[PDB]
PDB file of C-alpha atoms in Angstrom:
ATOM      1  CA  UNK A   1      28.894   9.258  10.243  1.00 13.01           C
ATOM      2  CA  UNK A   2      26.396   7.687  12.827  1.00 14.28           C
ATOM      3  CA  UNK A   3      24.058   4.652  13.097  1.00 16.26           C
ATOM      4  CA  UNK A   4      21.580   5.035  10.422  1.00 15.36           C
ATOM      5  CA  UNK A   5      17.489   4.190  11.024  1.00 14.36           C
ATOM      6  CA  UNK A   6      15.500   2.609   8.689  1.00 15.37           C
ATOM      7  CA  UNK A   7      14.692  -0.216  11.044  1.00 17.05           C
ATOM      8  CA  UNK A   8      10.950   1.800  12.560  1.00 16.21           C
ATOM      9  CA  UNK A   9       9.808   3.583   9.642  1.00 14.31           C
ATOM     10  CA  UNK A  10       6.715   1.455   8.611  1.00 13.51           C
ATOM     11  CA  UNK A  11       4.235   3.797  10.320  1.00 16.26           C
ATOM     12  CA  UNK A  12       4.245   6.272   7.345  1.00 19.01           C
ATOM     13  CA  UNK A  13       5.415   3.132   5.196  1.00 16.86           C
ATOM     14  CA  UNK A  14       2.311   0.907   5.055  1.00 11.73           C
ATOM     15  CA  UNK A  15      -0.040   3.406   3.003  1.00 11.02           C
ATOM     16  CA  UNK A  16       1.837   3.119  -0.485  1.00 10.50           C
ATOM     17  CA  UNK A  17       2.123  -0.862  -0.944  1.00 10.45           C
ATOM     18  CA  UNK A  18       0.061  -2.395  -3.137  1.00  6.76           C
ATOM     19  CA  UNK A  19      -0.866  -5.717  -0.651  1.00  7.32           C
ATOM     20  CA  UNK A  20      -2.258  -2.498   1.524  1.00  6.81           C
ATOM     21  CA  UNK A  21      -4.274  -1.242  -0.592  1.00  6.08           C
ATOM     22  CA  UNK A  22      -6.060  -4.995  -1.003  1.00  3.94           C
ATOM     23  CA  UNK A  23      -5.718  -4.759   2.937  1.00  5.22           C
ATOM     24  CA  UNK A  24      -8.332  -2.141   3.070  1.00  6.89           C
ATOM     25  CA  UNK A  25     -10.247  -3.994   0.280  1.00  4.89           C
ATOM     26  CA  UNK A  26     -11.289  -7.542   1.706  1.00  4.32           C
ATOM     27  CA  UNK A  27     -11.550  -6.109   5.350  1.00  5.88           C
ATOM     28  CA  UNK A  28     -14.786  -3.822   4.396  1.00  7.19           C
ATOM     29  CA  UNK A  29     -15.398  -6.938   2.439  1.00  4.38           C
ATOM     30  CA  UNK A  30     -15.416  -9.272   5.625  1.00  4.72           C
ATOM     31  CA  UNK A  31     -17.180  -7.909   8.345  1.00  7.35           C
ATOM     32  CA  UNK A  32     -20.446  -7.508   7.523  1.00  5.85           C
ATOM     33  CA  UNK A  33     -20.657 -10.805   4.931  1.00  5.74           C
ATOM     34  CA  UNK A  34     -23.235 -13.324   6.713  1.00  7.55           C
ATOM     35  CA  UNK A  35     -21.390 -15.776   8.521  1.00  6.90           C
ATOM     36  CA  UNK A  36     -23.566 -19.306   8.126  1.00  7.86           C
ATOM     37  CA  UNK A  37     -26.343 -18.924   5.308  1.00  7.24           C
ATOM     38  CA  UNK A  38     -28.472 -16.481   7.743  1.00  6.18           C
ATOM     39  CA  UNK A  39     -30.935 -14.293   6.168  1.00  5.71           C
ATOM     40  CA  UNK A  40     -31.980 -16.088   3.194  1.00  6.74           C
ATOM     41  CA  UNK A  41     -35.467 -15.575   3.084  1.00  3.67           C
ATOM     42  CA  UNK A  42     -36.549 -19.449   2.502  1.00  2.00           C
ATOM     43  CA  UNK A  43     -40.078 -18.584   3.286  1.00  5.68           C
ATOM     44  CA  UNK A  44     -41.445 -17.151   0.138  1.00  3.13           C
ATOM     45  CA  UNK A  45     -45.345 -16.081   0.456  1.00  2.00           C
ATOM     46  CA  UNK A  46     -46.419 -14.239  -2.538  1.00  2.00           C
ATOM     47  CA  UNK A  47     -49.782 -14.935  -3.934  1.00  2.00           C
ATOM     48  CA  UNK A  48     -49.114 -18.246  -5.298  1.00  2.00           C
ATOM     49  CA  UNK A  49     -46.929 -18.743  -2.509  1.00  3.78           C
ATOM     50  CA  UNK A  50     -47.453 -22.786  -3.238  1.00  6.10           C
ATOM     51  CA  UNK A  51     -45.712 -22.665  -6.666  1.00  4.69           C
ATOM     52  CA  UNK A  52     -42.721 -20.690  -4.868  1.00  3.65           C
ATOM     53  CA  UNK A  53     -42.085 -23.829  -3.532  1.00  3.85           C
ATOM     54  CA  UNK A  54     -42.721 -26.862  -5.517  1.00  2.00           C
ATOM     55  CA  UNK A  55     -41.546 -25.775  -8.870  1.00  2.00           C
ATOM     56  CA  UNK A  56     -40.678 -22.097  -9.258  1.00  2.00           C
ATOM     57  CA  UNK A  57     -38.005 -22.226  -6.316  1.00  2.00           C
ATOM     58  CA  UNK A  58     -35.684 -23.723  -9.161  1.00  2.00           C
ATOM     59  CA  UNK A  59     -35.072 -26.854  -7.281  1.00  2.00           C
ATOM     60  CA  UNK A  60     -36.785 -28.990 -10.030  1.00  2.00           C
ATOM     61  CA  UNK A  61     -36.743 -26.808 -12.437  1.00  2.00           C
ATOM     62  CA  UNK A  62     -38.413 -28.973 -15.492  1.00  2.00           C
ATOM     63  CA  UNK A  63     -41.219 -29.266 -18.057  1.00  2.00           C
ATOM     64  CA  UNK A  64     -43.761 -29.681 -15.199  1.00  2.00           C
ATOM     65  CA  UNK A  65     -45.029 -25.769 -15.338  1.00  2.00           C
ATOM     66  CA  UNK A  66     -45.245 -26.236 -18.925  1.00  2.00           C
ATOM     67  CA  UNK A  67     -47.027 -29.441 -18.602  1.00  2.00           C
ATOM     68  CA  UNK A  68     -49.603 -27.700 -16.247  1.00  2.00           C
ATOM     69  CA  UNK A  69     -49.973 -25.277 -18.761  1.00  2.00           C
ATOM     70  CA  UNK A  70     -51.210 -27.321 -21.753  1.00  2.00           C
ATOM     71  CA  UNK A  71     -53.218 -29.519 -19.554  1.00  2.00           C
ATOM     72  CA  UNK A  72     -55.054 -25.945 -18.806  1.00  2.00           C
ATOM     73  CA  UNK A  73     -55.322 -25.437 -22.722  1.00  2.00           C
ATOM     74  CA  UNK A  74     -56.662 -29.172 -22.071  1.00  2.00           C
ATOM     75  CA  UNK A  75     -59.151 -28.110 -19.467  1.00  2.00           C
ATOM     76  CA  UNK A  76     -60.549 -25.649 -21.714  1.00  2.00           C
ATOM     77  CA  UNK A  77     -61.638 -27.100 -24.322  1.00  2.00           C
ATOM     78  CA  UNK A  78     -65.421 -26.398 -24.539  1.00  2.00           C
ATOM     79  CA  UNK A  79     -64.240 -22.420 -23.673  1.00  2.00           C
ATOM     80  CA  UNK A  80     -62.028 -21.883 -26.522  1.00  2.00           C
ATOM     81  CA  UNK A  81     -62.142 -24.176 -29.352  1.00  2.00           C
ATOM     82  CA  UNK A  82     -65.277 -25.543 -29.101  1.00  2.00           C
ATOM     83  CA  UNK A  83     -68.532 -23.102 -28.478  1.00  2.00           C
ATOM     84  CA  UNK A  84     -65.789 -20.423 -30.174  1.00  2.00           C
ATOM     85  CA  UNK A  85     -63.043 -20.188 -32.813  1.00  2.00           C
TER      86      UNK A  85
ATOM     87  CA  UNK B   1      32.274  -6.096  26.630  1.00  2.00           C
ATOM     88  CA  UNK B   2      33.702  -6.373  23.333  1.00  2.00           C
ATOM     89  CA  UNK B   3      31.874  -9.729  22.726  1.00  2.00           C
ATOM     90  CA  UNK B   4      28.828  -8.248  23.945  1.00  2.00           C
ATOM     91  CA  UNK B   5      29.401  -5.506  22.306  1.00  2.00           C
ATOM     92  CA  UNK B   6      28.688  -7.436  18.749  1.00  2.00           C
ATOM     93  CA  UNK B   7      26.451 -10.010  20.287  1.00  2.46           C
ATOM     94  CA  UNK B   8      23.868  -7.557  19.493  1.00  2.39           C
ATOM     95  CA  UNK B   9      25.389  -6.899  16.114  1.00  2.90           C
ATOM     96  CA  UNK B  10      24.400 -10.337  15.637  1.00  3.61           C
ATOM     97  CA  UNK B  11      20.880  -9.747  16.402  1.00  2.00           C
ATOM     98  CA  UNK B  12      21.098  -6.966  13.396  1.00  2.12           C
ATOM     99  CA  UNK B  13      22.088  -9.475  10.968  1.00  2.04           C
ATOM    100  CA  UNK B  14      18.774 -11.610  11.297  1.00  2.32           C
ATOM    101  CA  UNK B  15      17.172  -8.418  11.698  1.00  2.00           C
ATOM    102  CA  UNK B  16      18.691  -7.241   8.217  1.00  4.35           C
ATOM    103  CA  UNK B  17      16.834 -10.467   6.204  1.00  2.00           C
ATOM    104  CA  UNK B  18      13.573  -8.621   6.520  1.00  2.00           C
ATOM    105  CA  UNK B  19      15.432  -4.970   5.193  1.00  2.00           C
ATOM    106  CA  UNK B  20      17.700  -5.150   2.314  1.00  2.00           C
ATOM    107  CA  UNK B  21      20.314  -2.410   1.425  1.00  2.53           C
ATOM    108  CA  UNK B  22      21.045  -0.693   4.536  1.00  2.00           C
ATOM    109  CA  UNK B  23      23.543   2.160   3.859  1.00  3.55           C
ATOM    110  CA  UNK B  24      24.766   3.113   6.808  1.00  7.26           C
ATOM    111  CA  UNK B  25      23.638   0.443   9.837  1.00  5.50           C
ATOM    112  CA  UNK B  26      26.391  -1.947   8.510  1.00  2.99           C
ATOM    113  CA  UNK B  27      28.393   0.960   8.075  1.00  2.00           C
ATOM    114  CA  UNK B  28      27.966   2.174  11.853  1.00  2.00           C
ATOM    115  CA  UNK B  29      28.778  -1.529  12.905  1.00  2.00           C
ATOM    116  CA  UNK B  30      31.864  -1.494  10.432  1.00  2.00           C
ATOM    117  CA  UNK B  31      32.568   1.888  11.700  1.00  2.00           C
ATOM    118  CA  UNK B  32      32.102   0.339  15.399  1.00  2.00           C
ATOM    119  CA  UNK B  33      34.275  -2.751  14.663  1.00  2.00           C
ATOM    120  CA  UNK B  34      36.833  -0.496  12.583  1.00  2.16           C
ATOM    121  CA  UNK B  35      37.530   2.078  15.647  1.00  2.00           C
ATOM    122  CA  UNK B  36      37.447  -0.891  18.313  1.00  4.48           C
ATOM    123  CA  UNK B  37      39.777  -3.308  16.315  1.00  6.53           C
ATOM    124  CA  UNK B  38      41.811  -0.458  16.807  1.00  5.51           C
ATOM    125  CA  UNK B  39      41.361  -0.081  20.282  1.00  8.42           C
ATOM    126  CA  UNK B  40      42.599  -3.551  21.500  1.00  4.64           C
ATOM    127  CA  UNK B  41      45.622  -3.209  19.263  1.00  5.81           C
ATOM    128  CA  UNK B  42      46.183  -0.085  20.751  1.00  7.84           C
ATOM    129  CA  UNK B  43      45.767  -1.578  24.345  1.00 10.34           C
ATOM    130  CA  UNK B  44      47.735  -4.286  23.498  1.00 11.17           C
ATOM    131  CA  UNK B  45      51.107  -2.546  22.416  1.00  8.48           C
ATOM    132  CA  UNK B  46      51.280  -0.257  24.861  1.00 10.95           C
ATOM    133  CA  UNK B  47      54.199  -0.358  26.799  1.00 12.92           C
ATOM    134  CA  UNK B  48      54.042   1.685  29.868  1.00 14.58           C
ATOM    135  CA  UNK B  49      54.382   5.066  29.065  1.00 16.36           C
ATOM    136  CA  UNK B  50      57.286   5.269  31.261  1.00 18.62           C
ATOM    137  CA  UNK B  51      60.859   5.611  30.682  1.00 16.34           C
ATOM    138  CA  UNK B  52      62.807   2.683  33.145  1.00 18.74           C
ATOM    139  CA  UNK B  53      65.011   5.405  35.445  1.00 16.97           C
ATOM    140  CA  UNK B  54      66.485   2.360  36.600  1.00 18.53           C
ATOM    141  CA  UNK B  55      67.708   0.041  33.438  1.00 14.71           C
ATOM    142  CA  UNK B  56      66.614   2.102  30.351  1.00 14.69           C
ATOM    143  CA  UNK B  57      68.326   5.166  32.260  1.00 14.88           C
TER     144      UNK B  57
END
C-alpha cells in the first residue's frame, strides 16, 4: 500500500543480539587491561628479599632450597644430634 | 526519468543482501514498476483524443 521501512531500524535493534551482548563484554574487558607488561612489580623486597630473586622467583625452581636446607641440618650438627638427642 | 527512476531501485537490490525478507519494499518497487509499465503503454496508444473533422468526419 506504500514503501515499507525496515531499512533504519537498528537503533532499537542492536540491544537483543547475542554478538551485542559479547560487544559490551570484551569492551569493559579492553580498556583498562595493561597494554605492554607495565605494573608487574619485578622488584620484590620482603625480608629475605635475596631469595625472592635467586630461587623463590620460580625462575629455577629446583632442589637448590632443599639442598640449602639439609646442608643447615648439616651445619648443625653439634646443636642437635650431638650435645642432644 | 523512467531509467532513473529504477536506477535507484538498483541500489535497493545490493542494499537488500544485508536484509532478507522484505515484505513490502519489493512490493512498493513492483507496485512502482506495475503502475508505470502501465503508464508508457498508456502513453504509447494514445491516439489523439480527437475526432479528424476533416477525414474521419
Amino acid at each position: 500500500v506504500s514503501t515499507l521501512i525496515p531499512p533504519k531500524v537498528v537503533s532499537s535493534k542492536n540491544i537483543g543480539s547475542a554478538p551485542n551482548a559479547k560487544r559490551i563484554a570484551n569492551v569493559v574487558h579492553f580498556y583498562k587491561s595493561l597494554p605492554q607488561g607495565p605494573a608487574p612489580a619485578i622488584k620484590a623486597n620482603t625480608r629475605l628479599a635475596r631469595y625472592k630473586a635467586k630461587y623463590f622467583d620460580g625462575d629455577n625452581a629446583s632442589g637448590k632450597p632443599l639442598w640449602h636446607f639439609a646442608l643447615g641440618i648439616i651445619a648443625f650438627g653439634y646443636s642437635m644430634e650431638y650435645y642432644f638427642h | 526519468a523512467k531509467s532513473a527512476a529504477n536506477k535507484l531501485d538498483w541500489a535497493k537490490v545490493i542494499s537488500s543482501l544485508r536484509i532478507t525478507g522484505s515484505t513490502a519494499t519489493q512490493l512498493s518497487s513492483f507496485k512502482k514498476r506495475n503502475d508505470e509499465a502501465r503508464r508508457q503503454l498508456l502513453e504509447l496508444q494514445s491516439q489523439p483524443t480527437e475526432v479528424d473533422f476533416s477525414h474521419y468526419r
